[PDB]
Amino acid sequence: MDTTVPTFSLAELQQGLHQDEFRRCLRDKGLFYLTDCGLTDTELKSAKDLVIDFFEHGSEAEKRAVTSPVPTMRRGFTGLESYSMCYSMGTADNLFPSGDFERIWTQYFDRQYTASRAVAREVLRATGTEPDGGVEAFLDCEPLLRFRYFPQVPEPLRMAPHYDLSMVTLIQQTPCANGFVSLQAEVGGAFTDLPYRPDAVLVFCGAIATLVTGGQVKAPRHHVAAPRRDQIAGSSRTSSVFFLRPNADFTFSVPLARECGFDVSLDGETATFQDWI
Ligand SMILES: CC1(C)S[C@@H]2[C@H](NC(=O)[C@@H](N)c3ccccc3)C(=O)N2[C@H]1C(=O)O
């Protein structure tokens, strides 16, 4: 029945407002838009503008020097040379075309990481959860930021819904000129579209939220629908996805894990994050 996605301000949540609405949302939907956390459309536009700049005007040699050496190294670019381009970075071992690039993207990462820690803090507090070793050690982690740009042109294997392997994930997207929403999830047994919203950021909870809160938070299945050969006049878009992932050494009791419906990939009593990849 219920297929709407609520918006909340983070400031408002930190002041004890909307406690019930937010508790229920987490348990029943695991996803929500969020205002008044320290991100801006502008910050995003400028990080984007700088990447696209490089994509178009970068020497062939410059590009080689920061293309990702191997798929394992999820750092640097992919798909920019001679179904789209992609830039990835983490807390370290990053690759960088220029000095001003380093500064803008390092700052955009820190900001995204500060926001995503803040949201996570709120998700734990709402469900009364103190992970072992404390909230802060848990939240001080090994995150990853994938930015992805789909350019234009004019001259489709539908992948299946997944849940994310993250405490939380934050998505900012620029829109499509043609109104096409490429991002969909399951809210109350239906597929709901999740557009760009002005000065909001989309937030999925993930497996680790479910695990860490003892089952209290849902991790919604979602997928990125590509467009067909008919709605591509004005369908350039970007998204910026930030995975707040735990430290490899984090652990969870396996009775509880399969109890939800996640890939039982290890045959043990309890386990850690890293081997589950
Ligand atoms: C479409 C998405 C927003 S979600 C999807 C997927 N997320 C995961 O499975 C994630 N837990 C993961 C990432 C990398 C290695 C192992 C596991 C991913 O990556 N895609 C994103 C994207 O556009 O880059």
Ligand SMILES: [Fe+3]
């Ligand atoms: Fe995902």
